[PDB]
Amino acid sequence: EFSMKSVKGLLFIIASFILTLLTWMNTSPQFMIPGLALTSLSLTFILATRLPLLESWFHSLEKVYTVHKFTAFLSIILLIFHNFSMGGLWGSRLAAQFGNLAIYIFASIILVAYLGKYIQYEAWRWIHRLVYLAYILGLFHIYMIMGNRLLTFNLLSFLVGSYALLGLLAGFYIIFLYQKISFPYLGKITHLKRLNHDTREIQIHLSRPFNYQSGQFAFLKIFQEGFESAPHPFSISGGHGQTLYFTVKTSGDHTKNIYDNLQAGSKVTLDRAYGHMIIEEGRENQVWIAGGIGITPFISYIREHPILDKQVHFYYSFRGDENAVYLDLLRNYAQKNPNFELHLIDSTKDGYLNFEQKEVPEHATVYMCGPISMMKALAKQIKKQNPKTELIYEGFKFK
Numbered sequence: 273e274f275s276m277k278s279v280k281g282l283l284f285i286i287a288s289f290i291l292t293l294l295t296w297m298n299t300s301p302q303f304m305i306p307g308l309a310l311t312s313l314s315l316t317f318i319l320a321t322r323l324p325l326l327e328s329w330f331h332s333l334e335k336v337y338t339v340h341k342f343t344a345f346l347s348i349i350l351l352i353f354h355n356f357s358m359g360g361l362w363g364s365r366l367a368a369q370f371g372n373l374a375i376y377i378f379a380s381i382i383l384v385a386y387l388g389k390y391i392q393y394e395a396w397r398w399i400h401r402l403v404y405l406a407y408i409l410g411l412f413h414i415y416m417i418m419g420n421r422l423l424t425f426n427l428l429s430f431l432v433g434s435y436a437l438l439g440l441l442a443g444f445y446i447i448f449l450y451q452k453i454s455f456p457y458l459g460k461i462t463h464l465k466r467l468n469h470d471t472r473e474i475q476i477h478l479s480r481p482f483n484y485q486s487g488q489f490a491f492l493k494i495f496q497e498g499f500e501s502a503p504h505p506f507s508i509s510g511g512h513g514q515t516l517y518f519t520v521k522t523s524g525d526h527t528k529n530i531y532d533n534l535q536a537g538s539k540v541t542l543d544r545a546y547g548h549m550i551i552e553e554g555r556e557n558q559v560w561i562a563g564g565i566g567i568t569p570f571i572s573y574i575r576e577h578p579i580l581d582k583q584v585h586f587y588y589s590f591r592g593d594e595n596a597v598y599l600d601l602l603r604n605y606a607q608k609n610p611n612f613e614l615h616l617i618d619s620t621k622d623g624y625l626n627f628e629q630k631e632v633p634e635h636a637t638v639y640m641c642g643p644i645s646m647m648k649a650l651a652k653q654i655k656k657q658n659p660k661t662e663l664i665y666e667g668f669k670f671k
């Protein structure tokens with residue numbers, strides 16, 4: 273659920289609407305519903321830019337995309353009501369037909385985005401990118417309809433023009449510029465290690481130092497023959513300065529490509545570090561819960577803090593010893609640091625991790641990274657045990 277950490281973002285959205293609502297009501301009340309929709313459209317584009325300000329305001333990329341979806345849905349309902357109030361299925365003049373086309377494209381794209389989950393990610397993104405054409409058609413329709421009412425010196429013209437320009441610039445940046453100018457970290461793969469039957473470790477040497485906190489993730493683009501160049505999100509699993517580590521598990525065609533065919537010497541590019549699950553910013557008493565590949569952020573901490581300063585209880589749940597990674601590393605960390613307690617849960621033979629009887633230390637932050645059902649069950653159990661415990665979790669998907 274949303275908390276105060278996103279309030280700066282939320283007040284940005286609400287003030288975006290109220291200021292819109294009071295503007296149209298002052299000038300053209302008959303257009304409050306469509307005008308608000310226009311705002312709700314531009315915000316949507318702004319929520320797709322992945323800018324650091326958005327992450328700061330909404331505290332997380334997952335919350336950013338939740339608000340993105342909510343604004344998209346609000347826009348589509350407002351536009352459907354506007355269409356029902358002002359016309360039919362097809363207009364008689366070009367200005368109205370532009371709006372007809374824009375609303376049709378918006379509805380089709382929203383339906384495909386919500387109901388298309390097994391579509392390939394790149395094909396999904398290509399279909400999703402038609403929102404820019406729908407938005408341009410909508411702006412054309414608005415400006416032919418209004419004429420010399422958005423082209424004067426008043427609050428309405430400045431509001432509509434500023435929001436439209438912000439949406440246009442955000443869409444152009446995310447669709448055309450972001451993958452070509454916002455990936456300044458140029459690196460080369462130096463070493464590859466297959467940790468088990470379906471996980472591989474990638475070591476990257478960069479031309480510039482990379483700054484990140486343990487528990488954060490980045491977007492990686494690989495440039496090798498037979499590989500897709502699209503950016504994939506991966507947790508930074510280690511490295512300091514010009515060296516980076518990524519631990520990639522086979523989860524599809526691209527990750528299987530990484531496992532079998534990736535080679536040392538291949539060029540890679542990275543944009544920056546994202547994430548709110550910063551372990552070093554938590555309380556002294558800590559509980560770490562990982563499931564499968566969700567161990568990747570915690571490993572970063574272990575790799576970057578040879579001496580532990582916190583009271584850490586780590587629960588690592590895996591399906592059999594063949595699905596476990598970094599077991600020797602965790603055992604060495606436990607042996608070297610007496611303040612690091614390690615609990616390995618072979619869920620194949622032990623069963624699911626249950627926290628109803630397990631005791632959490634007082635005044636503690638819990639970090640969870642695993643399958644979403646596991647996180648939900650453990651969060652319910654821990655909240656039932658102690659409502660004052662801090663709970664932080666990281667999801668491995670945006671939609």
Ligand SMILES: Cc1cc2nc3c(=O)[nH]c(=O)nc-3n(C[C@H](O)[C@H](O)[C@H](O)COP(=O)(O)OP(=O)(O)OC[C@H]3O[C@@H](n4cnc5c(N)ncnc54)[C@H](O)[C@@H]3O)c2cc1C
Pocket residue numbers: 389392393489502503504505506507508519520521522523524525526527528565568569667668669670671
């Ligand atoms: C914040 C974050 C951190 C992650 N950290 C790790 C990590 O440390 N190790 C690891 O192995 N995996 C990690 N992942 C997951 C990893 O990014 C996906 O498994 C990978 O992108 C899927 O590639 P694929 O083509 O093999 O999968 P596919 O078979 O194409 O799809 C599997 C699923 O992965 C997601 N996905 C696919 N392509 C993309 C894409 N380009 N961008 C975003 N999501 C996509 C979708 O939800 C899709 O349903 C992380 C994901 C996120 C969001």
Ligand SMILES: NC(=O)C1=CN([C@@H]2O[C@H](COP(=O)(O)OP(=O)(O)OC[C@H]3O[C@@H](n4cnc5c(N)ncnc54)[C@H](O)[C@@H]3O)[C@@H](O)[C@H]2O)C=CC1
Pocket residue numbers: 521523563564565566567589590591619620624625641642643644645646647649666667668669
């Ligand atoms: N942060 C996230 O959202 C993460 C998501 N994933 C994703 O989940 C998928 C599964 O891959 P893996 O993690 O390798 O395997 P996995 O999900 O099968 O293994 C994770 C561990 O959690 C346990 N588990 C699963 N559901 C549970 C529940 N309801 N209650 C208790 N324990 C439960 C499993 O028994 C296993 O030991 C992948 O696509 C991966 O990307 C995995 C880890 C982190």
Ligand code: HEM
Pocket residue numbers: 313316317320337340341344345347378382385386397400401403404443446447670671
């Ligand atoms: C209806 C108005 C919408 C607009 C204007 C819009 C716009 C965009 C744009 C321009 C992008 C970036 C495209 C790119 O990277 O090339 C994006 C990304 C994204 N959108 Fe939308 N979108 C809309 C609706 C939705 C809906 C309905 C959903 C989900 C149900 C959604 C979920 C996402 C997600 C998860 C991403 C991240 C893509 C990634 O991880 O690479 N959007 N959006």
Ligand code: HEM
Pocket residue numbers: 303306307308309310351354355358359360361362363364365368369371372373374375378406410411413414417418
């Ligand atoms: C934001 C301010 C907007 C204003 C002031 C506005 C104004 C108007 C007006 C006056 C009409 C009736 C004109 C006519 O039917 O001949 C109309 C119709 C329509 N508008 Fe808008 N509009 C706005 C936004 C939008 C947007 C963004 C879209 C689509 C994305 C849209 C889609 C439509 C549709 C589908 C019709 C029906 C046309 C018809 O059936 O003839 N409107 N609008």
